Amino acid sequence: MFPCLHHSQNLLRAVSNMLQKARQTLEFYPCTSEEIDHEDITKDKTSTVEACLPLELTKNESCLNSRETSFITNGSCLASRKTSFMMALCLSSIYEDLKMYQVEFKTMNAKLLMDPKRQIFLDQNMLAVIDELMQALNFNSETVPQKSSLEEPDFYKTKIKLCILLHAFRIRAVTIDRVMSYLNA
Amino acid sequence: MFPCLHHSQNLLRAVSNMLQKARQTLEFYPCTSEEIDHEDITKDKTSTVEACLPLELTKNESCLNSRETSFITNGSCLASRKTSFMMALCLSSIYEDLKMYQVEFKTMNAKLLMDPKRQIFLDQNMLAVIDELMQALNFNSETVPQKSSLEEPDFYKTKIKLCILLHAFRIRAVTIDRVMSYLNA
Amino acid sequence: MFPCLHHSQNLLRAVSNMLQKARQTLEFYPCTSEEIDHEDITKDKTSTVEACLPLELTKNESCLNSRETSFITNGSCLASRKTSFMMALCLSSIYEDLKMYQVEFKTMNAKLLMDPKRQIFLDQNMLAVIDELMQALNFNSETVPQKSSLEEPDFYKTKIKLCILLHAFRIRAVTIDRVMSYLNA
Amino acid sequence: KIDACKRGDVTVKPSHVILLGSTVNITCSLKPRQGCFHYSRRNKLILYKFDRRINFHHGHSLNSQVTGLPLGTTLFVCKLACINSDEIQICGAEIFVGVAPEQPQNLSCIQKGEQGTVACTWERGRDTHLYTEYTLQLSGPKNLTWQKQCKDIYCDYLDFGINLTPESPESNFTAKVTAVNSLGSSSSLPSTFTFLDIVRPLPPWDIRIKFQKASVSRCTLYWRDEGLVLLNRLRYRPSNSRLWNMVNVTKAKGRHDLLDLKPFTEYEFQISSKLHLYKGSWSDWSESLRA
Amino acid sequence: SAERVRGDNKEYEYSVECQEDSACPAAEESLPIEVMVDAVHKLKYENYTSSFFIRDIIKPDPPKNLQLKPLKNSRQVEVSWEYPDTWSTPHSYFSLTFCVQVQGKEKKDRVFTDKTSATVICRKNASISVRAQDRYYSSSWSEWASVPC
Numbered sequence: 003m004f005p006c007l008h009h010s011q012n013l014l015r016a017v018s019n020m021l022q023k024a025r026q027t028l029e030f031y032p033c034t035s036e037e038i039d040h041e042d043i044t045k046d047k048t049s050t051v052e053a054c055l056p057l058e059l060t061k062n063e064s065c066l067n068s069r070e071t072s073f074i075t076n077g078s079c080l081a082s083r084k085t086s087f088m089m090a091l092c093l094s095s096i097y098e099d100l101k102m103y104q105v106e107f108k109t110m111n112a113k114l115l116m117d118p119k120r121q122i123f124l125d126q127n128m129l130a131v132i133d134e135l136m137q138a139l140n141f142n143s144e145t146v147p148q149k150s151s152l153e154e155p156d157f158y159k160t161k162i163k164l165c166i167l168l169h170a171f172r173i174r175a176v177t178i179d180r181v182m183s184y185l186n187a
Numbered sequence: 188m189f190p191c192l193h194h195s196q197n198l199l200r201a202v203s204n205m206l207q208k209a210r211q212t213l214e215f216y217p218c219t220s221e222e223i224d225h226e227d228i229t230k231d232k233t234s235t236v237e238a239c240l241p242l243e244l245t246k247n248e249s250c251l252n253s254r255e256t257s258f259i260t261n262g263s264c265l266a267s268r269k270t271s272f273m274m275a276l277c278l279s280s281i282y283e284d285l286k287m288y289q290v291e292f293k294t295m296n297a298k299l300l301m302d303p304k305r306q307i308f309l310d311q312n313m314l315a316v317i318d319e320l321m322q323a324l325n326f327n328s329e330t331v332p333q334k335s336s337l338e339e340p341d342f343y344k345t346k347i348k349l350c351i352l353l354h355a356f357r358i359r360a361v362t363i364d365r366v367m368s369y370l371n372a
Numbered sequence: 373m374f375p376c377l378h379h380s381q382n383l384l385r386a387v388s389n390m391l392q393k394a395r396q397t398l399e400f401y402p403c404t405s406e407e408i409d410h411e412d413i414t415k416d417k418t419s420t421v422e423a424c425l426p427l428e429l430t431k432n433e434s435c436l437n438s439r440e441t442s443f444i445t446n447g448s449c450l451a452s453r454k455t456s457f458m459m460a461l462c463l464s465s466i467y468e469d470l471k472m473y474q475v476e477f478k479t480m481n482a483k484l485l486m487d488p489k490r491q492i493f494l495d496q497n498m499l500a501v502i503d504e505l506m507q508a509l510n511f512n513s514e515t516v517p518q519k520s521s522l523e524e525p526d527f528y529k530t531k532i533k534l535c536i537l538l539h540a541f542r543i544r545a546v547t548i549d550r551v552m553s554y555l556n557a
Numbered sequence: 558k559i560d561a562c563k564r565g566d567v568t569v570k571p572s573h574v575i576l577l578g579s580t581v582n583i584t585c586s587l588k589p590r591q592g593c594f595h596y597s598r599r600n601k602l603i604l605y606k607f608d609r610r611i612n613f614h615h616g617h618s619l620n621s622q623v624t625g626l627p628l629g630t631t632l633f634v635c636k637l638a639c640i641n642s643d644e645i646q647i648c649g650a651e652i653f654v655g656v657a658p659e660q661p662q663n664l665s666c667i668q669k670g671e672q673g674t675v676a677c678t679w680e681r682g683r684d685t686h687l688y689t690e691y692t693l694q695l696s697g698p699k700n701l702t703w704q705k706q707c708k709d710i711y712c713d714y715l716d717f718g719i720n721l722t723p724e725s726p727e728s729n730f731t732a733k734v735t736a737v738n739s740l741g742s743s744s745s746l747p748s749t750f751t752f753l754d755i756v757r758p759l760p761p762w763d764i765r766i767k768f769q770k771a772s773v774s775r776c777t778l779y780w781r782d783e784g785l786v787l788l789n790r791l792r793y794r795p796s797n798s799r800l801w802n803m804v805n806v807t808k809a810k811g812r813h814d815l816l817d818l819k820p821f822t823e824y825e826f827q828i829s830s831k832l833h834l835y836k837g838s839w840s841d842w843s844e845s846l847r848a
Numbered sequence: 849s850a851e852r853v854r855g856d857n858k859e860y861e862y863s864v865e866c867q868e869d870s871a872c873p874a875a876e877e878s879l880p881i882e883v884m885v886d887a888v889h890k891l892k893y894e895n896y897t898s899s900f901f902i903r904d905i906i907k908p909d910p911p912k913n914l915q916l917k918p919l920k921n922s923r924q925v926e927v928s929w930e931y932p933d934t935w936s937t938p939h940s941y942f943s944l945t946f947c948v949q950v951q952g953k954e955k956k957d958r959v960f961t962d963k964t965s966a967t968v969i970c971r972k973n974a975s976i977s978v979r980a981q982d983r984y985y986s987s988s989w990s991e992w993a994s995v996p997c
């Protein structure tokens with residue numbers, strides 16, 4: 003049993019439940035996988051797409067581009083002398099992916115609360131799981147400050163952006179789960 | 188107020204009380220500063236003697252020997268982007284000094300307990316303060332495992348070695364306190 | 373939402389899962405509700421059967437027999453000045469019911485572990501839930517000491533007694549859940 | 558008092574635990590007050606092993622002598638069949654057939670690093686079908702000792718949480734393992750280990766490659782490991798094909814003037830250290846350093 | 849590929865084999881693969897375009913080495929199966945979920961087990977069948993693998 007793998011399995015399950023709630027709440031807003039384009043915020047910032055691979059799959063090492071964002075932050079998920087750099091870079095990039103998403107999700111939630119009704123709001127449990135996993139991934143975890151606005155934003159745009167992020171995040175959550183399973187075995 | 192400075196001030200005070208107890212308990216064993224030679228276990232292993240200096244005092248940087256033991260372990264005492272490398276190397280070396288002393292002090296205490304009488308034993312509070320300071324100095328703190336022996340050692344040799352270490356450690360404790368005061372101001 | 377009601381709902385669910393496991397593990401041992409007689413260990417010791425009723429249902433008060441076992445232990449589940457004695461006696465009796473069952477379940481588990489194979493063993497999670505609920509029910513909670521035997525008991529008798537207790541405990545768990553729901557509403 | 562068996566009681570001779578090969582006298586006896594409500598010469602008192610009929614007596618007293626029981630547990634349940642009513646289970650016995658426990662042939666104790674918890678490993682042998690209790694005892698020169706018990710039926714190893722500090726580098730410490738089961742007890746032969754044999758140096762955690770601060774072929778390797786190492790070994794083998802690694806290096810944390818190939822092609826580097834040349838195990842090779 | 853007789857038309861099925869020739873391995877796909885078929889018949893030209901992701905179109909092959917092992921002196925029977933060789937490796941990073949239906953020939957005996965061995969009571973007059981799907985994402989179910997019981 004791997005504790006980070008348990009957190010990652012909790013993350014994928016939490017996103018799956020939130021995604022189901024989002025489809026039910028926003029009946030008109032189009033939130034089916036077919037009608038929602040895949041857009042990834044972390045497209046160029048992080049190297050999870052390349053660094054997070056089984057050791058057998060990655061060989062030439064040429065594609066790792068000049069140790070891109072090679073922070074290699076030390077953390078409680080692995081041990082400093084336990085695994086190869088290929089997994090050390092991957093764990094740092096996964097931490098960065100969760101930081102980029104959590105900062106955005108909190109911004110969306112703060113705008114959603116202002117709605118006169120409560121049609122939809124991001125799951126507090128899902129946000130807590132993202133923070134818990136980041137704390138294990140990197141010791142120098144930064145907790146996002148409470149975000150708020152002094153004005154009211156258009157709600158339709160936030161609800162379309164929300165659906166686009168949730169689906170992309172779910173794909174990211176499976177990718178983290180596969181890496182955690184590989185680390186355990 | 189600096190929390191690490193408070194721990195260092197607690198350390199110097201704890202050593203001062205233990206040193207006074209040691210002189211009273213071992214009346215025959217010679218434990219006065221005049222009769223005890225200065226011997227430092229961390230003579231060559233760590234660069235606290237050179238790295239831990241006020242920024243004004245250190246200039247040529249030639250004497251820092253090839254970044255000796257330049258682990259630069261990140262820790263809660265300072266912030267990663269807060270102070271110059273001269274203090275980052277110093278904090279790592281201070282952590283190493285406390286690790287070398289704690290491992291030795293625990294070995295002496297385990298031998299002292301076997302004594303039929305209880306003439307002297309290392310202060311549990313002083314050992315706890317050393318561990319607390321190390322936890323702040325470096326996140327990857329290693330807790331020393333309970334040490335024990337299956338035989339009985341000569342006690343006179345342990346009691347002479349104890350006095351030699353206590354006096355040397357007290358000088359080290361003032362050096363840590365001066366650095367912590369400089370960091371605060 | 374009532375926190376004790378949440379613990380009681382957790383208790384009923386935990387017993388339901390353990391009961392299903394017991395039927396699957398002990399295929400030959402008869403553990404169907406039809407073949408297992410109802411026997412309650414707490415038949416005369418506690419007054420949960422009479423004290424734990426909705427206020428509308430209990431009126432003559434004659435049937436409460438001379439304030440039987442009227443310890444009225446104060447606890448975090450209710451408040452001291454919040455509810456009528458009829459519910460105060462009930463909460464004490466429920467605490468006593470959980471104490472009688474936990475002491476017995478631990479005795480059975482200690483005998484079950486000695487089995488050369490591991491056909492069945494009491495759920496650690498279910499035992500933990502019983503302890504958590506008791507801590508809320510009464511401040512002076514007593515934690516049962518680790519129980520062990522220096523000999524090996526007959527296993528068939530323990531496995532028949534286990535099935536008889538599990539079914540009776542499940543009925544008790546629903547009774548606690550009904551009282552917790554009434555307290556919440 | 559909850560009672561599992563109310564209608565009748567079943568006894569086993571000699572006991573539920575028997576040596577492989579022995580014969581058990583399972584006897585099902587019915588209390589006089591309990592019984593078939595209507596006496597009829599149709600009701601029976603069956604005995605079943607894994608729900609398989611072995612015997613049937615109309616009378617309350619039923620006697621059976623099962624033989625050739627294999628290793629394992631066999632559930633003998635004795636049910637009552639009346640004339641028209643369904644069979645009521647009355648009482649049953651679970652029998653564990655077991656054999657004398659195997660003695661551990663080999664015992665080895667290994668401590669990881671200068672600071673480590675001693676861990677001892679043994680070969681359990683054939684698994685007796687019975688609860689197994691393992692006791693590990695470690696004694697020093699004079700007979701002081703540390704004992705821990707591995708109650709778990711299967712134990713990979715038992716670890717002494719207490720660290721061992723050797724009064725002198727050459728001392729004799731003796732370790733023994735005892736296995737006890739209902740049927741019998743087997744104790745491993747005492748094995749005497751000097752502290753150097755138990756200790757195993759940690760693989761060097763640090764590694765640095767420098768080409769003598771120049772473009773020259775000569776390379777200097779700056780690694781770090783446990784302080785008490787009086788020997789060391791380095792892998793200078795070419796990465797494409799492994800060739801030979803130097804048997805010993807000088808007592809230097811930082812290698813100097815090592816002969817390295819003139820090309821800058823990536824080379825794998827592995828490092829090991831020996832705490833004592835005379836009686837110390839070699840450390841595991843350090844994580845390979847690429848180029 | 850085939851010449852089936854749907855109705856009387858006899859539809860003929862034509863298929864292509866395509867392999868992603870990208871050398872660099874990547875954990876997740878950001879772009880859908882696009883396939884264009886330029887159908888030509890006599891003097892008539894038509895073109896068809898399809899866009900998809902490999903994970904969405906993945907269909908696992910049936911579970912391999914399915915065997916039934918009866919537990920000693922018990923009604924239930926343990927059944928053990930193994931991962932298909934064709935499926936990508938390592939089997940840890942890429943995982944499958946096995947659904948076991950014992951209905952054979954009560955309506956739904958389907959049980960979803962991540963484990964490679966599950967225990968099911970075997971009626972003498974039925975077959976036990978296993979199916980494989982990608983555990984991580986929803987994928988087309990594999991063909992049933994049936995062993996007589």
Ligand SMILES: *[C@@H]1O[C@H](CO)[C@@H](O)[C@H](O)[C@H]1NC(C)=O
Binds near residue numbers: 570571581582620622
């Ligand atoms: C079993 O019982 C029979 C008759 O009761 C007796 O002859 C035999 O010696 C017994 N054997 C054992 C092993 O008790």
Ligand SMILES: *[C@@H]1O[C@H](CO)[C@@H](O)[C@H](O)[C@H]1NC(C)=O
Binds near residue numbers: 699700
């Ligand atoms: C230590 O124990 C062994 C075995 O019990 C015994 O032979 C030996 O004489 C003992 N030594 C002392 C000094 O008691």
Ligand SMILES: *[C@@H]1O[C@H](CO)[C@@H](O)[C@H](O)[C@H]1NC(C)=O
Binds near residue numbers: 727728729
């Ligand atoms: C340990 O035992 C060996 C052989 O039994 C002996 O040669 C050696 O001197 C002993 N060591 C000590 C410290 O007694």
